[PDB]
Short mmCIF file of N, CA and C in Angstrom, two decimals:
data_model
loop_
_atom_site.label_atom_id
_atom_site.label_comp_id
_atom_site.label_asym_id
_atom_site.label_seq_id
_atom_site.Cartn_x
_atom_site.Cartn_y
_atom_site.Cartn_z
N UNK A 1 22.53 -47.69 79.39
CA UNK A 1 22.76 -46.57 78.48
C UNK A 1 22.10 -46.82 77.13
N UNK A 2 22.96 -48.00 76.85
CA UNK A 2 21.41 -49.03 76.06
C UNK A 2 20.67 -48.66 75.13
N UNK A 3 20.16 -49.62 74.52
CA UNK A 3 20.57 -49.69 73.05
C UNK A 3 20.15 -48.60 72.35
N UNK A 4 18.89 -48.31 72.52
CA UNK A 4 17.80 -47.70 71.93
C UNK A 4 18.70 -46.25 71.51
N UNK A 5 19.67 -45.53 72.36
CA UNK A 5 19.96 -44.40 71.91
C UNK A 5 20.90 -44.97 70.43
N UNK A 6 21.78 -46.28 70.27
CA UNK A 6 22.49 -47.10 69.38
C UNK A 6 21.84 -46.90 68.51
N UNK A 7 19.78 -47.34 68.25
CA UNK A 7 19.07 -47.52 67.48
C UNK A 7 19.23 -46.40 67.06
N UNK A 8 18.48 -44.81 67.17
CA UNK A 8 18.72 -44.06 66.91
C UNK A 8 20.10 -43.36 66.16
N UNK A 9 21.20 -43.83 66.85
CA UNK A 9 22.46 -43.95 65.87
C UNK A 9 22.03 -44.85 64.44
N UNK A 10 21.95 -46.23 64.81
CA UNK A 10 22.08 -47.05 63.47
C UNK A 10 21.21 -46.36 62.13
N UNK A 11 19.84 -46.47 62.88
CA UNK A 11 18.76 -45.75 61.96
C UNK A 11 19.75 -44.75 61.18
N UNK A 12 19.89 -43.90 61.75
CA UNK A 12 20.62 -42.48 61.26
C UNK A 12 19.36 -41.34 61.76
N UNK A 13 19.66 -41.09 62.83
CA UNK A 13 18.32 -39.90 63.39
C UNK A 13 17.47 -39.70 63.17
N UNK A 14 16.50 -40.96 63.15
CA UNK A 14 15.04 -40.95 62.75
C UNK A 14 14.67 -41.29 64.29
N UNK A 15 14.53 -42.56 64.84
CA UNK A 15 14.10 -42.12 66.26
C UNK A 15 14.32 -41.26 67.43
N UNK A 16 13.84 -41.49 68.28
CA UNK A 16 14.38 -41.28 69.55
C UNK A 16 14.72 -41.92 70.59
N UNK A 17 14.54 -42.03 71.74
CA UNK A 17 14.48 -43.30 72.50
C UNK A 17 13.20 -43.93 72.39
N UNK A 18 12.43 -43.33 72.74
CA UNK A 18 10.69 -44.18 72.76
C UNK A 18 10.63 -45.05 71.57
N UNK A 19 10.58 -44.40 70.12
CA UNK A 19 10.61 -45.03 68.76
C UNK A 19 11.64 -46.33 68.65
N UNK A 20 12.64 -46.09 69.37
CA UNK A 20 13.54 -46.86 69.37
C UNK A 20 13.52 -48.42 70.03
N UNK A 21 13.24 -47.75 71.28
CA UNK A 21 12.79 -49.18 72.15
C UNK A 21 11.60 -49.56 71.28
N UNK A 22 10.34 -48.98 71.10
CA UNK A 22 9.13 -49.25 70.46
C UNK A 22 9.71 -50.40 69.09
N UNK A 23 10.27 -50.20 67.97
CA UNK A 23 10.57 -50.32 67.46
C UNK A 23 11.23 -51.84 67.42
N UNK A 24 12.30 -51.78 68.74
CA UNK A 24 12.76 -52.61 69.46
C UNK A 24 11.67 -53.75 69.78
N UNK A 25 10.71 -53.39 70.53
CA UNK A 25 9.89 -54.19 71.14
C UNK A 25 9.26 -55.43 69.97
N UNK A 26 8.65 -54.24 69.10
CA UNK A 26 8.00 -54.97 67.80
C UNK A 26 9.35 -55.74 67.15
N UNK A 27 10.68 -55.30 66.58
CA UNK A 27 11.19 -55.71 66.25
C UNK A 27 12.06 -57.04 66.69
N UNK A 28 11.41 -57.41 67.76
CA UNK A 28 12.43 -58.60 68.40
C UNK A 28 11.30 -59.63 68.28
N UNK A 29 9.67 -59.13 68.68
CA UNK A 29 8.57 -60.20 68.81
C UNK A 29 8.29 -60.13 67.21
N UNK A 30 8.17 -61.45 66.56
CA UNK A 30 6.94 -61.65 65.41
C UNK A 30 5.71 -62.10 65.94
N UNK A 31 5.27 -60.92 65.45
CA UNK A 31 3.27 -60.82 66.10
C UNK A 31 3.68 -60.84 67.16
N UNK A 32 3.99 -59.66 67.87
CA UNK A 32 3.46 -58.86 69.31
C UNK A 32 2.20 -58.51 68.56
N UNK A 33 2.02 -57.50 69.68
CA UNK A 33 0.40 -56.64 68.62
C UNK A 33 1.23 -54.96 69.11
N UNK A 34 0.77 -54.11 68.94
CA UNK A 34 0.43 -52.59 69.80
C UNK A 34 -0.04 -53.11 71.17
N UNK A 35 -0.78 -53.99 71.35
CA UNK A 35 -1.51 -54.16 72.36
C UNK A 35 -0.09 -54.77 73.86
N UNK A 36 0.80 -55.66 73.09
CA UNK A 36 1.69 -55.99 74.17
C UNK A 36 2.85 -54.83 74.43
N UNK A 37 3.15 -54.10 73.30
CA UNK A 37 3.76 -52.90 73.31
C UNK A 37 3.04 -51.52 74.35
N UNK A 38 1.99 -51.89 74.64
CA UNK A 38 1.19 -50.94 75.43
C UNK A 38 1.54 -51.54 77.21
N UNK A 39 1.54 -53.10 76.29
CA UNK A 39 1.41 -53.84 77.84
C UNK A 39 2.80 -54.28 78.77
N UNK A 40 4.32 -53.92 77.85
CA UNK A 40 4.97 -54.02 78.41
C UNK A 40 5.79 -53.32 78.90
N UNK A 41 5.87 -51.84 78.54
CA UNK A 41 6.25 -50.45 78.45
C UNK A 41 5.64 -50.06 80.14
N UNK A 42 7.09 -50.59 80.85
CA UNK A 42 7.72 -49.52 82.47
C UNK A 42 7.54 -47.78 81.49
N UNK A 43 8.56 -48.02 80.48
CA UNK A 43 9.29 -46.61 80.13
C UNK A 43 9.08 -46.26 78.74
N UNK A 44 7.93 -46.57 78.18
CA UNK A 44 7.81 -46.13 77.12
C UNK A 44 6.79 -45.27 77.02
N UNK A 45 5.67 -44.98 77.72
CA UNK A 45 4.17 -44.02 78.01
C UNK A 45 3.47 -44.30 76.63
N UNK A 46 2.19 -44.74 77.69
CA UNK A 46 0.77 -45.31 76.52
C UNK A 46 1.02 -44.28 75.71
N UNK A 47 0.42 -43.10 75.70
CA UNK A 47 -0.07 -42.19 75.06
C UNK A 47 1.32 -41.87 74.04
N UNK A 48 2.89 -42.06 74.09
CA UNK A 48 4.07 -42.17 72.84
C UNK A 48 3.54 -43.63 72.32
N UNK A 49 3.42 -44.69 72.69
CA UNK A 49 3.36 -45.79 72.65
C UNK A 49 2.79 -46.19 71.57
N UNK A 50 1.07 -45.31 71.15
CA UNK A 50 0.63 -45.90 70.40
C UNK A 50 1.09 -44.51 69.24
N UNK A 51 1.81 -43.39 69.62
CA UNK A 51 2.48 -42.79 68.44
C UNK A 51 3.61 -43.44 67.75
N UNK A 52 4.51 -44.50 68.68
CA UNK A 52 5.51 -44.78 68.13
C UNK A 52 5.55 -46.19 67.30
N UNK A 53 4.55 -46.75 67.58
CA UNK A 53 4.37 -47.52 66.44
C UNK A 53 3.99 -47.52 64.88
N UNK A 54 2.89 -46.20 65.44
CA UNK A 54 2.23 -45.93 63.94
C UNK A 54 2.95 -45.20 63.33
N UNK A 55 4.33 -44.35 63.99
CA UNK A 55 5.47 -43.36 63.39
C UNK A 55 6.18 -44.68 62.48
N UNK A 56 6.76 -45.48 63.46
CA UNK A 56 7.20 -46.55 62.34
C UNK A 56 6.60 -46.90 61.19
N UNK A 57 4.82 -47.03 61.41
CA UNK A 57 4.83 -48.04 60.48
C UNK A 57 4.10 -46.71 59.08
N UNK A 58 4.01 -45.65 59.36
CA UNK A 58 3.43 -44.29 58.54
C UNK A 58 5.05 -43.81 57.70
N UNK A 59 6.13 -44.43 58.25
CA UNK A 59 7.39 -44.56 57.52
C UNK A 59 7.49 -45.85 56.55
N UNK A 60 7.32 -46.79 57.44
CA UNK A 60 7.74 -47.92 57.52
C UNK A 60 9.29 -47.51 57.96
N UNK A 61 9.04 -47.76 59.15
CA UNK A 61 9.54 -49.71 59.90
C UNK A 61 8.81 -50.25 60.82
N UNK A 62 7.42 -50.61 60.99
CA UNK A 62 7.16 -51.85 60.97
C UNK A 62 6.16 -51.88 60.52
N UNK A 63 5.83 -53.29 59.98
CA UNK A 63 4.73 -53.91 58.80
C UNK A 63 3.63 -54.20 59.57
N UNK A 64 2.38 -53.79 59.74
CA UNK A 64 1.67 -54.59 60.76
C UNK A 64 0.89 -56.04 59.90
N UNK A 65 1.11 -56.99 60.74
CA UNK A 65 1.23 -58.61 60.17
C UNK A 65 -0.26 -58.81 61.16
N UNK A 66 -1.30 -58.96 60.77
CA UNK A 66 -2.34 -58.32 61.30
C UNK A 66 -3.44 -59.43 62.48
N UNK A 67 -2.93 -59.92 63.14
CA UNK A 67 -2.51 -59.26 64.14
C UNK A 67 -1.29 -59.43 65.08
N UNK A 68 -0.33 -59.10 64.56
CA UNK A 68 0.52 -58.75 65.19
C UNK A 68 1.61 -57.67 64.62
N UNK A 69 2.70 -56.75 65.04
CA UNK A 69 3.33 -56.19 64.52
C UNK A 69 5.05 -56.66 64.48
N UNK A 70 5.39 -56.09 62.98
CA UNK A 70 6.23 -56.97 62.99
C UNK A 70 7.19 -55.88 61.55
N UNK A 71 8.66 -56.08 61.59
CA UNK A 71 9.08 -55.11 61.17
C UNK A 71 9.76 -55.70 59.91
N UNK A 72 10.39 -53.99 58.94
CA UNK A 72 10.37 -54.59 57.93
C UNK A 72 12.11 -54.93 57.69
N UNK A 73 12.92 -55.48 56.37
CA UNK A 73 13.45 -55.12 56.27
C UNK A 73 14.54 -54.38 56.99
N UNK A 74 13.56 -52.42 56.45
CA UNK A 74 14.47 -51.52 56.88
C UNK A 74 15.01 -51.29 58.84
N UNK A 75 14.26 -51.92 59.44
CA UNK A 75 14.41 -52.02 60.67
C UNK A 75 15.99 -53.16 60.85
N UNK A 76 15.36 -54.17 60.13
CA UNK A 76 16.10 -55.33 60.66
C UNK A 76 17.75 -55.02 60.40
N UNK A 77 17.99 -53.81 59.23
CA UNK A 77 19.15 -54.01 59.50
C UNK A 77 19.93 -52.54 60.21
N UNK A 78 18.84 -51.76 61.03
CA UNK A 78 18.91 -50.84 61.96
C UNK A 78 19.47 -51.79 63.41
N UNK A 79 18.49 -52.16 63.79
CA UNK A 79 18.60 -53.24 65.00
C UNK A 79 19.96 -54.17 65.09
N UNK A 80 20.05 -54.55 63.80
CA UNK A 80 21.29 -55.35 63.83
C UNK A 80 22.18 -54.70 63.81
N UNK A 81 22.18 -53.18 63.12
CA UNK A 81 23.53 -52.44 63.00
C UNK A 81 23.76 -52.02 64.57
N UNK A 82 22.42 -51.60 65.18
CA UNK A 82 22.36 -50.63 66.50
C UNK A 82 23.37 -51.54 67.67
N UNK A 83 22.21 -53.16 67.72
CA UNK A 83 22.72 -53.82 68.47
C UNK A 83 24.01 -54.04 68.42
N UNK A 84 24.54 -54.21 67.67
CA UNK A 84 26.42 -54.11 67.33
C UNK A 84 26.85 -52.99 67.71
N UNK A 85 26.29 -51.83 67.64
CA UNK A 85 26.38 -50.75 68.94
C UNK A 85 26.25 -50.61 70.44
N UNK A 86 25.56 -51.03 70.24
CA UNK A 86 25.32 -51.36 71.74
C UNK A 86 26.56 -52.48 72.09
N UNK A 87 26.96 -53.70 71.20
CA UNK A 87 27.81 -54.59 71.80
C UNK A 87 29.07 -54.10 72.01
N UNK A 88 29.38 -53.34 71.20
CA UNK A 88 30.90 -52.30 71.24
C UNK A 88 31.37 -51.90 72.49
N UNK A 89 30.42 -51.33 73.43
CA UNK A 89 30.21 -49.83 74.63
C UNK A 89 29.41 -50.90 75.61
N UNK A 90 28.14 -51.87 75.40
CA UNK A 90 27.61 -52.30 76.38
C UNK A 90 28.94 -53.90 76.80
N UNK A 91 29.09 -54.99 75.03
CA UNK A 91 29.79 -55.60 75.08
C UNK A 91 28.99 -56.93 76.28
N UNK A 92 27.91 -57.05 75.86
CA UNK A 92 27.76 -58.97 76.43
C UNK A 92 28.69 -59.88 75.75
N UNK A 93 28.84 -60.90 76.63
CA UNK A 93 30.06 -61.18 77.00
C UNK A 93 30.98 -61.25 76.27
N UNK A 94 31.66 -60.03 75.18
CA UNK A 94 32.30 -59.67 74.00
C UNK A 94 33.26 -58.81 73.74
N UNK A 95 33.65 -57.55 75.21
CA UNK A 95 34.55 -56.59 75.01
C UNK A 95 35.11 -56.78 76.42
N UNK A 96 34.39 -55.97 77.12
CA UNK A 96 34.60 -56.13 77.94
C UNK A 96 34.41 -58.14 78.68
#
């Protein structure tokens, strides 16, 4: 159900799911590139893929660290708020 819709909560309705996971992706690797975000995305589609990075980073949230991408700040305490969303309802090994 997972996280990404959380992200979108934490943020406060700036993503969506794609942005979210995207976001996600960059935000967990320091220096991924776009390029592994292209390359690891089952469910994210090239063609959002390379929108949802540059949506982040034409906001900022994420910094591109050149070469790799990598987020700022305002992400980090989205992700951290989200993921604590997600732990509430998903709950590794913490609620349930």
């Amino acid at each position: 159900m997972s996280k990404v819709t959380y992200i979108i909560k934490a943020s406060n309705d700036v993503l969506n799911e794609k942005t979210a996971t995207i976001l996600i992706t960059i935000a967990k690797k320091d220096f991924i590139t776009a390029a592994e975000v292209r390359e690891v995305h089952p469910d994210l589609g090239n063609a959002v893929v390379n929108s949802n990075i540059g949506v982040l980073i034409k906001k900022g949230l994420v910094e591109k660290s050149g070469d790799g991408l990598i987020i700022t700040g305002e992400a980090q305490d989205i992700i951290s708020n989200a993921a604590t969303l997600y732990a509430q309802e998903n709950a590794p090994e913490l609620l349930k």
